[PDB]
Design an enzyme around this catalytic site. Structure first.
Site, PDB file in Angstrom:
ATOM      1  N   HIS A  60      38.863  37.583  40.456  1.00 65.50           N
ATOM      2  CA  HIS A  60      39.419  36.455  39.721  1.00 65.50           C
ATOM      3  C   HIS A  60      39.426  35.321  40.694  1.00 65.50           C
ATOM      4  O   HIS A  60      39.617  35.546  41.875  1.00 65.50           O
ATOM      5  CB  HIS A  60      40.893  36.681  39.402  1.00 65.50           C
ATOM      6  CG  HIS A  60      41.186  37.895  38.588  1.00 65.50           C
ATOM      7  ND1 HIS A  60      41.194  39.165  39.118  1.00 65.50           N
ATOM      8  CD2 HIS A  60      41.585  38.021  37.302  1.00 65.50           C
ATOM      9  CE1 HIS A  60      41.592  40.021  38.197  1.00 65.50           C
ATOM     10  NE2 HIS A  60      41.833  39.350  37.084  1.00 65.50           N
ATOM     11  N   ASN A  86      51.093  40.432  25.739  1.00 63.98           N
ATOM     12  CA  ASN A  86      52.329  39.658  25.572  1.00 63.98           C
ATOM     13  C   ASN A  86      52.094  38.404  24.725  1.00 63.98           C
ATOM     14  O   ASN A  86      51.061  38.307  24.075  1.00 63.98           O
ATOM     15  CB  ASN A  86      52.935  39.288  26.951  1.00 63.98           C
ATOM     16  CG  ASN A  86      51.973  38.492  27.850  1.00 63.98           C
ATOM     17  OD1 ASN A  86      50.897  38.965  28.198  1.00 63.98           O
ATOM     18  ND2 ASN A  86      52.398  37.306  28.271  1.00 63.98           N
ATOM     19  N   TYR A 130      41.813  33.253  40.944  1.00 62.87           N
ATOM     20  CA  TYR A 130      43.167  33.046  41.479  1.00 62.87           C
ATOM     21  C   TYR A 130      43.419  33.813  42.778  1.00 62.87           C
ATOM     22  O   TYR A 130      44.447  33.630  43.401  1.00 62.87           O
ATOM     23  CB  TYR A 130      44.270  33.365  40.455  1.00 62.87           C
ATOM     24  CG  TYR A 130      44.418  34.806  40.031  1.00 62.87           C
ATOM     25  CD1 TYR A 130      44.367  35.150  38.695  1.00 62.87           C
ATOM     26  CD2 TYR A 130      44.635  35.816  40.948  1.00 62.87           C
ATOM     27  CE1 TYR A 130      44.523  36.459  38.286  1.00 62.87           C
ATOM     28  CE2 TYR A 130      44.790  37.117  40.545  1.00 62.87           C
ATOM     29  CZ  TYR A 130      44.730  37.434  39.212  1.00 62.87           C
ATOM     30  OH  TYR A 130      44.844  38.736  38.794  1.00 62.87           O
ATOM     31  N   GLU A 131      42.464  34.644  43.190  1.00 56.50           N
ATOM     32  CA  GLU A 131      42.597  35.446  44.399  1.00 56.50           C
ATOM     33  C   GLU A 131      41.873  34.802  45.574  1.00 56.50           C
ATOM     34  O   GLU A 131      41.790  35.403  46.666  1.00 56.50           O
ATOM     35  CB  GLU A 131      41.976  36.833  44.188  1.00 56.50           C
ATOM     36  CG  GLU A 131      42.517  37.647  43.024  1.00 56.50           C
ATOM     37  CD  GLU A 131      41.644  38.852  42.714  1.00 56.50           C
ATOM     38  OE1 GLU A 131      40.690  38.702  41.942  1.00 56.50           O
ATOM     39  OE2 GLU A 131      41.895  39.950  43.245  1.00 56.50           O
ATOM     40  N   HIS A 180      55.132  40.518  34.672  1.00 56.71           N
ATOM     41  CA  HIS A 180      54.033  41.470  34.933  1.00 56.71           C
ATOM     42  C   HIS A 180      54.297  42.890  34.402  1.00 56.71           C
ATOM     43  O   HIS A 180      53.352  43.618  34.075  1.00 56.71           O
ATOM     44  CB  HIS A 180      53.628  41.531  36.412  1.00 56.71           C
ATOM     45  CG  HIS A 180      52.252  42.085  36.628  1.00 56.71           C
ATOM     46  ND1 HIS A 180      51.134  41.562  36.009  1.00 56.71           N
ATOM     47  CD2 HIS A 180      51.815  43.131  37.371  1.00 56.71           C
ATOM     48  CE1 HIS A 180      50.069  42.263  36.359  1.00 56.71           C
ATOM     49  NE2 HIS A 180      50.455  43.220  37.185  1.00 56.71           N
ATOM     50  N   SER A 196      42.827  44.409  33.176  1.00 57.21           N
ATOM     51  CA  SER A 196      43.987  45.076  33.737  1.00 57.21           C
ATOM     52  C   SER A 196      44.400  46.193  32.810  1.00 57.21           C
ATOM     53  O   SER A 196      44.472  46.004  31.593  1.00 57.21           O
ATOM     54  CB  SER A 196      45.155  44.109  33.923  1.00 57.21           C
ATOM     55  OG  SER A 196      44.971  43.300  35.073  1.00 57.21           O
ATOM     56  N   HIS A 207      41.530  50.061  46.123  1.00 62.00           N
ATOM     57  CA  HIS A 207      41.882  51.354  45.529  1.00 62.00           C
ATOM     58  C   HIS A 207      42.400  51.014  44.139  1.00 62.00           C
ATOM     59  O   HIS A 207      43.599  51.147  43.844  1.00 62.00           O
ATOM     60  CB  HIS A 207      42.970  52.020  46.388  1.00 62.00           C
ATOM     61  CG  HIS A 207      42.686  51.920  47.854  1.00 62.00           C
ATOM     62  ND1 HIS A 207      42.934  50.770  48.573  1.00 62.00           N
ATOM     63  CD2 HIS A 207      42.022  52.751  48.692  1.00 62.00           C
ATOM     64  CE1 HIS A 207      42.420  50.888  49.783  1.00 62.00           C
ATOM     65  NE2 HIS A 207      41.860  52.082  49.880  1.00 62.00           N
ATOM     66  N   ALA A 227      43.107  41.435  29.721  1.00 58.92           N
ATOM     67  CA  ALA A 227      44.444  41.473  29.149  1.00 58.92           C
ATOM     68  C   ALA A 227      44.733  40.006  28.988  1.00 58.92           C
ATOM     69  O   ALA A 227      44.307  39.209  29.814  1.00 58.92           O
ATOM     70  CB  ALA A 227      45.408  42.080  30.083  1.00 58.92           C
ATOM     71  N   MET A 287      42.835  34.784  32.556  1.00 58.70           N
ATOM     72  CA  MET A 287      42.400  34.204  33.814  1.00 58.70           C
ATOM     73  C   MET A 287      41.074  34.742  34.356  1.00 58.70           C
ATOM     74  O   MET A 287      40.810  34.604  35.564  1.00 58.70           O
ATOM     75  CB  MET A 287      43.480  34.450  34.866  1.00 58.70           C
ATOM     76  CG  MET A 287      44.853  33.892  34.527  1.00 58.70           C
ATOM     77  SD  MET A 287      46.103  34.378  35.754  1.00 58.70           S
ATOM     78  CE  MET A 287      47.604  34.141  34.744  1.00 58.70           C
ATOM     79  N   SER A 288      40.234  35.308  33.481  1.00 54.01           N
ATOM     80  CA  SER A 288      38.946  35.884  33.877  1.00 54.01           C
ATOM     81  C   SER A 288      37.966  35.890  32.701  1.00 54.01           C
ATOM     82  O   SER A 288      38.107  35.094  31.787  1.00 54.01           O
ATOM     83  CB  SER A 288      39.165  37.323  34.329  1.00 54.01           C
ATOM     84  OG  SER A 288      39.791  38.080  33.296  1.00 54.01           O
TER      85      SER A 288
HETATM   86  N1  LIG Z   1      47.717  33.029  31.707  1.00 48.69           N
HETATM   87  C1  LIG Z   1      48.097  34.186  31.176  1.00 48.69           C
HETATM   88  N2  LIG Z   1      47.411  35.261  31.441  1.00 48.69           N
HETATM   89  C2  LIG Z   1      47.880  36.355  30.856  1.00 48.69           C
HETATM   90  N3  LIG Z   1      47.346  37.635  30.962  1.00 48.69           N
HETATM   91  C3  LIG Z   1      48.185  38.458  30.173  1.00 48.69           C
HETATM   92  N4  LIG Z   1      49.191  37.772  29.590  1.00 48.69           N
HETATM   93  C4  LIG Z   1      48.965  36.448  30.047  1.00 48.69           C
HETATM   94  C5  LIG Z   1      49.704  35.290  29.759  1.00 48.69           C
HETATM   95  O1  LIG Z   1      50.707  35.195  29.048  1.00 48.69           O
HETATM   96  N5  LIG Z   1      49.184  34.166  30.386  1.00 48.69           N
END
Ligand SMILES: Nc1nc2[nH]cnc2c(=O)[nH]1
Ligand SMILES: Nc1nc2[nH]cnc2c(=O)[nH]1
Ligand SMILES: Nc1nc2[nH]cnc2c(=O)[nH]1
Lengths: 288, 288, 288
Positions: C85, C242, C87-88, C256, C32, C63, C115, C218-219
C-alpha cells in the site's frame, strides 16, 4: 523552484537572447496537434530543447519538442512546440521552467493551448473552449508549481488566481470569433487539470462534472499559475478532442486515435484563430 | 516518519527538557498574525528553532519562528510562533515534527490556530471559527503525515479522526464565548486544508463549498492528525481573514494585505479568548 | 516505472519461472483478512517476497506477505498474500510491481480483493461489493502508477479505464452468487481509493459520498490500473468491514478491531465465492 536557481533562469534567458536576434513579447504553448501553428511564423529561429541550457529535454518526443522564435500576425512570438507534462515524470518545476525564462526574455503575454475531453454536455468534439477558469486538482494536494521558497524577484508568496484568465483577452477573443463570422460558437468554461496518464472512468468523469468542470486535461494549469505569478497576461483555449460520462452503456471508451478532434481541420481552425488574435494582444509600446 | 527516527524525537525532547526548567502540558500553534499570544506568557524561555536539534528551521521567517515556553492563564505552555507549511517545501514529516516532540515533552493538549478564507456565506471577516471537523485534501492523495512505517510507540497504524476535535473542549469554548458576553458569535464549521501557496480561483472556491468546507487554509490538519495519533486532546480556531466565490463579477481577488482580518483588533480577540480557555483545559493532576 | 527497468521485470519473471514448475493464468491479490484463500490451493509453492529478486519486501508484515503458487478450482493461480500500500511508504511503482511480473509470467486475469468501509447506506457490514468502477483520488493529484516514461512493451501512454472492471466477469459473478442460492445479495458499486493510513472524519466521509463512492479503501486501484495497461482482465470485490458518516452523533469512530467484517465467517464467504469463480474465468486454451 527546487532544482532551479534564479541565475539558472537568468543564464538560460541571456543565452537564448544572445543566440537569437529576436526578443519575444508573446510565448505560445501548443497543445497536442496544435504544433502546426509553428508553420505560421515568419523568420523562425528554431532551438531544440536540448541545445538550450537548463531546458528540460523531451522524455520521448524531442522531434515534436522545440522552441521556435518568429513573428505571427504582428507580434514577436516564441512558441513551445511539445510541452512538458507531469505524467511524463517531470516535477512541476521543470514543466513550468519555460514560463520563468520567457518572463526573463521579455514576454508579457502567454497563450496556452491544449486538447481536452468534453465534460460539458453542450460541447461537441472539434469544438474550441475559451478557458475562463480552472480547477487545480493536483495543487489541492500539494502539486503546485509554486511550492518551495518563493522568489520575490519573480513574484509574491500567495498569488491570487481568481483573475488568471485575462478578462479583456477573453472578450476580444469572443468578439474575434464573431467578426470571423463563425458558425459553431466559441464555447467557454472551466478546465480541470488531472494528472495521471490514463483516461477517466465514468465514475471519475462524474466527479469532475459534479465539481463544475467543463473540459478535463493534463497540462496548462501549472504554466498558467507560474505565468501569473510573474505578472503575465494569460489566456487559452482547449480543443475538445473527445467526451464521455456514461456507466449506463458507455458503448465506447477512448484511447488516443480518438484524441484528434477532427484532426487537421479542427486544429487548423484554432491555429488561425490564435494567429488572428495576435493583432488583439496589446503592444508593450503602450499603443495609446 | 522518514528522515526522523524515534531517538531523534527522543533526543530533541530530552535536549529541550534539559534546557528548560519548564515541563509543558499545552502546546499552542499560532496562525498567521496570532503570534502575539506569546506576549501573554509569564516566565518565557525562548528557543530559536535553529538552536533546537533536529528542529526544522524556517525557510525565510525565523525572526517570526521560535518556540517559547511559559505560563498562560494557569497552564504550563509551549507556543510555536511561526509554524511550518508544506507550501514552503517541508515534507509533512518536518511540518508535524514539533507535535511528536511536544508529546515526548509531556504535552497532552494541542490548541492549533490558523488564518483561513471564508467559504461559508454566513461568515464575516474578523470572525472566529471553532474547528469542529476538517477535510484533508492532501491526505486523500497521499500527503498524510502518518505515511511510512508506523511507530506503535507513538500510535496505531490506522488512527480514527472522526473524533479529532475534542467535543468537550469545543463545548467549553462555546460556553466561554458566551460567558465573556460576546456580541458576534463564535462560529463553527469544517476546515478544508488545501496545499498550494497561491489562492483559489472562483471555480476552486466552488468545489470546496460543494464539498462542505466552511473555511479554507493551508496548515493545521497535518498537525491535528499526528497530535491525535499520539493521543493528544486537540481543539482549534480559524481567524477568518477574508472570503470569496463569485465568477459572476468577483470585483476583488485577494493577495495578502487582505489576510489581516481586521489585524490587531480581531487577532487580539482570539489571543485573549485562547488564554481564557487555559482555565478550561483539564489539569493532568486529574483535578477530581 | 522509475526504479524499475523492463529487464528487472524480465529477470524477476524468468527467475520465478525457473524456480517454479507452475505457469500461472490467474493472479489473485488478497485483501486484509482474505489471505486464507491461500489455504484453498493445491500444490502450493510458496515464495517469500524477499527471496524473489527485485520484489518489494514487507515494511512490517512479511509473515503475512508471501507469493504462493498453486491450483484453485480448475485454474493455475498465483496469490499475493499481503499486498503493498502506498500508506506504508512504497512508491506506487513498487506497490504495482507484482502485476507487471505476473503479466510476464503469463497471467491474463487479475482478481483483486480488499476490505473497505461502507459509504453506501444500503451496505451492511459483512457484505461483499462487486467493484463495478472506481474513483482514483491519488491519481487526480499525480499519484498514478503509470507516471513516468511509458513502456510500449507493456502498454500505451494513455490507457482507458472506463472499461476496467470486466463486464462479463462481473455478470458471471452476479450469476454465480445467485446459483449458490445466496441470501444476502452480492452488492455492487464504485470503490474510491484514498491514501492516508488514518481513517476518515465525517466531513471526509461526506465528500466521498457526494462524489459517488460506495466503499472507501486504500489499495486495489493502482494494481487495477497497471493490470489494465498490460491488457489483463480485471475483476474484484470489497469485503465491507465497517461504515460511517454522521457528525450528528457519531456514537462510534472505528480503529481496526472493527475492520474484521464478521471476521472468519464473512471472509470465508468471499474466499469460497472467489474459488467458485475460477471455473467462470476463461481458459487461455480458447475453450471454443
Ligand atoms: N479509508 C478507509 N479504509 C477502510 N478499509 C476498511 N474500512 C475502511 C474505512 O472505513 N476507511
Ligand atoms: N484526462 C483527459 N485528458 C484528455 N485530453 C483529451 N481528451 C482527454 C480526456 O478525455 N481525458
Ligand atoms: N487557501 C487559502 N488560504 C487562506 N488563508 C487565509 N485566507 C485564505 C484563502 O482565501 N485561501
Amino acid at each position: 523552484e527546487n532544482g532551479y536557481t534564479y541565475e539558472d533562469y537568468k543564464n538560460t534567458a541571456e543565452w537564448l537572447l544572445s543566440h537569437t536576434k529576436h526578443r519575444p513579447q508573446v510565448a505560445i504553448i501548443c497543445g497536442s496537434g496544435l504544433g502546426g501553428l509553428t508553420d505560421k511564423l515568419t523568420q523562425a529561429q528554431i532551438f531544440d530543447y536540448s541545445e538550450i541550457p537548463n531546458f528540460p529535454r523531451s522524455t520521448v518526443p524531442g522531434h515534436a519538442g522545440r522552441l521556435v522564435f518568429g513573428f505571427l500576425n504582428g507580434r514577436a512570438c516564441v512558441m513551445m512546440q511539445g510541452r512538458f507534462h507531469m505524467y511524463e515524470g517531470y516535477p512541476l518545476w521543470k514543466v513550468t521552467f519555460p514560463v520563468r525564462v520567457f518572463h526573463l526574455l521579455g514576454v508579457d503575454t502567454l497563450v496556452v493551448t491544449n486538447a481536452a475531453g468534453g465534460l460539458n454536455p453542450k460541447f461537441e468534439v472539434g469544438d474550441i473552449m475559451l478557458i475562463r477558469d480552472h480547477i487545480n486538482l493536483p495543487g489541492f494536494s500539494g502539486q503546485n508549481p509554486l511550492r518551495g521558497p518563493n522568489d520575490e524577484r519573480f513574484g509574491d508568496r500567495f498569488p491570487a488566481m481568481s483573475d488568471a484568465y485575462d478578462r479583456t483577452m477573453r472578450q476580444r477573443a469572443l468578439s474575434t470569433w464573431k467578426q470571423m463570422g463563425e458558425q459553431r460558437e466559441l464555447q467557454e468554461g472551466t478546465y480541470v487539470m488531472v494528472a495521471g496518464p490514463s483516461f477517466e472512468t465514468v465514475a471519475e468523469c462524474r466527479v469532475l462534472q459534479k465539481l463544475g468542470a467543463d473540459a478535463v486535461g493534463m497540462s496548462t494549469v501549472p504554466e498558467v499559475i507560474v505565468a501569473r505569478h510573474c505578472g503575465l497576461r494569460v489566456f487559452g483555449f482547449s480543443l475538445i478532442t473527445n467526451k464521455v460520462i456514461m456507466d449506463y452503456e458507455s458503448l465506447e471508451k477512448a484511447n488516443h486515435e480518438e484524441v484528434l478532434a477532427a484532426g487537421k481541420q479542427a486544429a487548423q481552425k484554432l491555429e488561425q484563430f490564435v494567429s488572428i488574435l495576435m493583432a488583439s494582444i496589446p503592444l508593450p509600446d503602450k499603443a495609446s
